[PDB]
Amino acid sequence: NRPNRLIVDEAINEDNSVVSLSQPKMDELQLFRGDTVLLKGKKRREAVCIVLSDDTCSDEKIRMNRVVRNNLRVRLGDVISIQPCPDVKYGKRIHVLPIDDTVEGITGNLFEVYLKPYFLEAYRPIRKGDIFLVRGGMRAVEFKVVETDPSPYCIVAPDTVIHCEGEPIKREDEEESLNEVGYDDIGGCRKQLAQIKEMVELPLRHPALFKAIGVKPPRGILLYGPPGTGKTLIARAVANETGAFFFLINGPEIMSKLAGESESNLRKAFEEAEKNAPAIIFIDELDAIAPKREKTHGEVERRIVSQLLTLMDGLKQRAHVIVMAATNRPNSIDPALRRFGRFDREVDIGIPDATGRLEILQIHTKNMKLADDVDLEQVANETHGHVGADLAALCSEAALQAIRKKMDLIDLEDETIDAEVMNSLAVTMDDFRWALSQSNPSALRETVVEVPQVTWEDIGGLEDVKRELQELVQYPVEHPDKFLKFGMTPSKGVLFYGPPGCGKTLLAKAIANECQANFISIKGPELLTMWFGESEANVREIFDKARQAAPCVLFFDELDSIAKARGGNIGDGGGAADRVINQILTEMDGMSTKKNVFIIGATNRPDIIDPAILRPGRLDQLIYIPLPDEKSRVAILKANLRKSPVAKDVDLEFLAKMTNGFSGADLTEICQRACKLAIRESIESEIVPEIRRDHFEEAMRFARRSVSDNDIRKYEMFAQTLQ
């Protein structure tokens, strides 16, 4: 269909002016990784960029960063024309020059720093007019090239004399400035980022179609998550990047006004925004306006929760407006806000995980120029519990520490503090570890939901259980119509039972990982909390959170916990049923047909579990998890030692021999007991620094087995008795 045009799409690399083509296009465009290519754009303008070769991209989507797009005036999902330019011709000092307000308090010589490092080792091709952006010294300043000695475009060479100027030509009115947040400023919430963009792509990008079609596009979207997880960030990025007019209501501003000065700004906020359409109204802190409940007193509060309901109703789909509202927990707001036609969509931004806390950290230091040893992987490992704002606060406190150890050491403080001096400034690992030492996990801790990092590589033995579990969890999600051929419902429960420390937890996490599914762990103390606190209404919030995190594995560990707290060898006079397990029964059997929520219980006392859990439509598959065998006891010892260094001198299958049986936990005990005797040696020294066989022999002096061969027979009994 005249394959010249191509779509624009996001790109992974940090560098500017690099487009990443789909590899089965090579000889079509005929141009390799050494050829720069001209790209057509809106208001009659272009750019030229060197090309990279990668597998994962789609065929039709060019991958390029924000700066190369803004000048093109392409917004993601737009199409550009890609035509080669082998005809490239080098320049002699293209003239480059500072812009915006960015251009903040800088002074002196910014060219040996904000240019010369960047142009070097590069040959970065530059067409006159590009905004190409540089970063250093806790700031991103971009230099627009106003003049190119040859034209239109030029490679840069190390041999072009370089022109010191530094004058502040103000940015033109019509371009929308770069400092503003795009999608690449959002680190760690991306699964849901596709979700919001999917909802809003067609309404915001294509106003014509919904006037040319019968259908209803989403009227309002409810972003919810703990505070500081980037909900405002998301709304702004989506608005800024689709180009739609972003209006911002925040609850306390509306609540700041007097009665009737309030709802006027409110009903003006939409009657102002529906002009500028397509537009996004972001109502963050929707709890401030709209907790319509028992708890509000007064008419004027109840008035404002009203009229918000009827501005939601008032948009007739001739409004191109999308309404986003940020909330913290969903029960927070008035339930009539969720009527269909007000806030129909509900999207949970959630706490970022270790794998996500990395990207956030890497977004909030892109201007710093760090120090070489800090790896941001273990920085991202001990920041657990931090939302993305906690993370932004960490690295800014890191950078204010390092500015405390240096610089004003001399007291160089002048009118405008020097450029080259902050670029020298670097922040080492001893700053960040000092940044964490502060209170910063002052944000929320509630039930986590993320894909665990335990692959099957971590579980010694249990081969048959590993394949049994895959069938249970995998085959239904992958191959449904096969289940439909025999008219079968996949069983959605499992109950692991066996002695303690045999890996019932590991297996559950391992299988969530193999599915790349979310894993919610409800541990024993949390069920006991509901049972003492007589609050089993919490079990509903647990399953609805699995439903929103689906596909997920929901794991009840120590499901016998409440049965124990009642005794159970003699125990109370009652039956097996109790408050909390009752609500687990209720919420299980009353759950949605298949949302890919798979329920795993685990127990070390299958004896005293109530049998109602067992009935079909519940945890329906009992899987015994035995004490390991020396076959497995070898892989248990290795999967523990696959991190810490273990010299060849100490040998395994002989340790795994001497134990008639231990738990996989008793073996980790031995391992960790040995590794303690080692570090004891290494800290002391020197006044050698690795593990040794005799470390493990002193460890084995304390090896105890927690399972007494009595109850294995008891466990052996529950096995054959049940079938």
Ligand X SMILES: Nc1ncnc2c1ncn2[C@@H]1O[C@H](COP(=O)(O)OP(=O)(O)O)[C@@H](O)[C@H]1O
* Sites of contact with ligand X (CB under 6 A): 185-189, 227-233, 284, 326, 352, 360, 363, 388-389, 392, 459-462, 500-506, 602, 628, 636, 639, 664-665, 668
3-state secondary structure of 69: helix
* 14 versus 589: smaller Cβ distance to its own copies: 589
Longest Cα–Cα distance of the chain, Å, equals 94
Q: For the CB of residue 307, give the shortest distance to its own copies in the complex, in Å.
A: 4
Q: Using the minimum distance from each CB to ligand X, give the nearer residue, 473 or 506.
A: 506
Residue from 283, 508, 553, 691 binding its own copies (CB under 8 A): 691
Tell me the two tokens of residue 368.
Answer: 């710093």
- 487 is an interface residue for its own copies by CB under 8 A: yes
Q: How far is the CB of 72 from ligand X (least distance, A)?
A: 25
Per CB under 8 A, does 557 bind its own copies?
no
Helix segments in 642-708, DSSP class H: 655-658, 664-684, 693-700
566 binds, among its own copies, ligand X, none (CB under 5 to 8 A by kind): its own copies
CA nearest neighbour of 399 among 427, 423, 371: 427
Tell me whether residue 228 is annotated as binding. yes
Q: Is the dihedral of CA 657, 660, 661, 662 positive or negative?
A: negative
| Cβ atoms 186, 193 nearer than 8 A | yes
Q: Which residues pair with 495 in a beta bridge?
A: 601, 622
- Which of its own copies, ligand X, none sits in contact with 664, Cβ below 5 to 8 A by type? ligand X
Q: Which of 112, 147, 175, 253 binds its own copies (CB under 8 A)?
A: 253
Kindly tell me which of 233 and 312 has the beta carbon lying closer to ligand X.
Answer: 233
As a whole number of angstroms, the distance between CA 494 and CA 466 comes to: 13
Q: Is 209 in the site for its own copies (CB under 8 A)?
A: yes
Q: Which of 288, 426, 652, 712 binds its own copies (CB under 8 A)?
A: 288
Can you read off the two tokens belonging to residue 103? 């251009």
Nearest to 566 by CA among 579, 555, 556: 579
Q: Where are the beta strands (DSSP E) in 307-448?
A: 322-327, 345-348
Distance in Å, CB of 24 to its own copies, minimum: 18
Q: Which does 461 bind (CB under 5 to 8 A by kind): its own copies, ligand X, none?
A: ligand X
> What's phi and psi for 632, nearest 5 deg?
-75, -35
Residue for token pair 């083509």: 21
Binding site partner of 288, from ligand X, its own copies, none, Cβ cut-off 5-8 A by kind: its own copies
Q: Report 257-286 residues binding its own copies (CB under 8 A).
A: 258-260, 263, 285
Phi, psi values for residue 450, rounded to 5°: -155, 165
Burial of 297 (0-12, 13-18, 19+ CB in 10 A): exposed
Helix 538-548 to helix 579-589 angle, to the nearest 10 degrees? Answer: 30
Q: Residues in contact with its own copies, total (CB under 8 A)?
A: 142
How far is the C-alpha of 185 from the C-alpha of 178, rounded, in Å?
11
Q: What's the rounded Cα separation, in Å, for the pair 566 and 579?
A: 12
231 makes contact, choosing from ligand X, its own copies, none, with CB < 5 to 8 Å by partner type, with: ligand X
Site for its own copies in 584-613 (CB under 8 A): 585-586, 589-590, 592-594, 612
- Cβ-closest residue to ligand X? 664
Contact of residue 233 among its own copies, ligand X, none (CB under 5-8 Å per partner type): ligand X
Which partner in its own copies, ligand X, none is near 79 (CB below 5 to 8 A by kind)?
Answer: its own copies
* Beta carbon of residue 153, minimum distance to ligand X (angstroms, whole number): 34
Q: Provide the strand spans (E) within 513-617.
A: 518-522, 552-556, 597-603
List strands edge to edge, sheet with 245-248: 245-248, 279-282, 322-327, 220-224, 345-348
Contact in structure between 167 and 144 (CB atoms under 8 Å): no
Q: How many Å apart are CA 223 and CA 186, to the nearest integer?
A: 15
Q: Is 717 in the site for its own copies (CB under 8 A)?
A: no
Is 364 labelled a binding residue?
yes
* Residue 431, binding choice from its own copies, ligand X, none, Cβ under 5 to 8 Å by partner class: none
Give the number of other Cβ atoms within 10 Å of residue 85's Cβ: 17
Task: CB nearer to its own copies: give 164 or 484.
Answer: 484
CB of 586 to ligand X, least distance (A): 17
Please report how close the Cβ of residue 451 comes to ligand X at its closest, in angstroms.
17
- Binding track over 163-202 against its own copies, x by CB under 8 A: -----------------------------------x--xx
**Closest approach of ligand X to the CB of residue 530, in Å:** 20
464 is a site residue for its own copies (CB under 8 A): no
Task: Map the footprint of its own copies across residues 66-95, applying CB under 8 A.
Answer: 79
Partner from ligand X, its own copies, none contacting 408, C-beta within 5 to 8 A by type: its own copies
The residues in 14-73 that bind its own copies, with binding defined as CB under 8 A, are none
The residue among 233 and 584 lying less far from ligand X, judged by its C-beta, is 233
- For residue 426, the partner it binds in ligand X, its own copies, none, with Cβ less than 5 to 8 A by kind, is none
Residue 327 pairs with which residues in a beta bridge? 224
Q: Please say which residue, 45 or 564, places its beta carbon nearer to its own copies.
A: 564
Q: Tell me the two tokens of residue 288.
A: 């401030």
The rounded distance, in Å, linking the Cα atoms of 206 and 77 is 11
The pair of three-digit structure tokens given for residue 62, joined into one six-digit string: 């060019």
Stretches 61-69, 162-170, 239-247, 526-534: which one binds its own copies (CB under 8 A)?
526-534
DSSP state of 78: B
579 binds its own copies (CB under 8 A): yes
Q: By CB under 8 A, is residue 561 in contact with its own copies?
A: yes
- Contact window for its own copies (CB under 8 A) among 33-41, 50-58, 68-76, 561-569: 561-569
Measured from the CB atom, the residue of 404 and 631 that comes closer to its own copies is 404
Which tokens belong to 261?
A: 């000065």
Site string for its own copies, 352-381 (x = CB under 8 A): ---------------x----------x---
The nearer residue to its own copies, 23 or 256, going by C-beta atoms, is: 256
Candidates 411, 648, 660, 687; binder of its own copies (CB under 8 A) is 411
Residue 229 assigned ligand-binding role: yes
Q: Are 165 and 213 in contact (CB under 8 A)?
A: no
Interface segment toward its own copies; rule CB under 8 A; list 22-30, 141-149, 290-298, 455-463: 290-298
- The candidate with the shortest Cα–Cα distance to 452, out of 494, 543, 515, 359, is 515
Q: Does 687 bind its own copies (CB under 8 A)?
A: no
Instruction: Confirm whether residue 462 is marked as ligand binding.
Output: no
Whole-angstrom Cα distance, residue 173 to residue 612? 69
Q: How far is the CB of 523 from ligand X (least distance, A)?
A: 10
Rounded to an integer, what distance in angstroms lies between the CA atom of residue 108 and that of residue 159?
A: 24
483 binds, among its own copies, ligand X, none (CB under 5 to 8 A by kind): its own copies
- 266 Cβ contact list (under 8 Å, min separation 6): 249, 254, 289, 304, 307, 308, 311
Instruction: Single out the residue of 118, 125, 49, 142 nearest to residue 90, CA to CA.
Output: 125
Q: Is 526 in the site for its own copies (CB under 8 A)?
A: yes
Q: After which residues is the chain broken (C to N over 2.5 A)?
A: 687
Which residue type is seen at 601? G
Annotated binding site for ATP: which residue ranges?
Answer: 227-233, 328, 364, 501-506
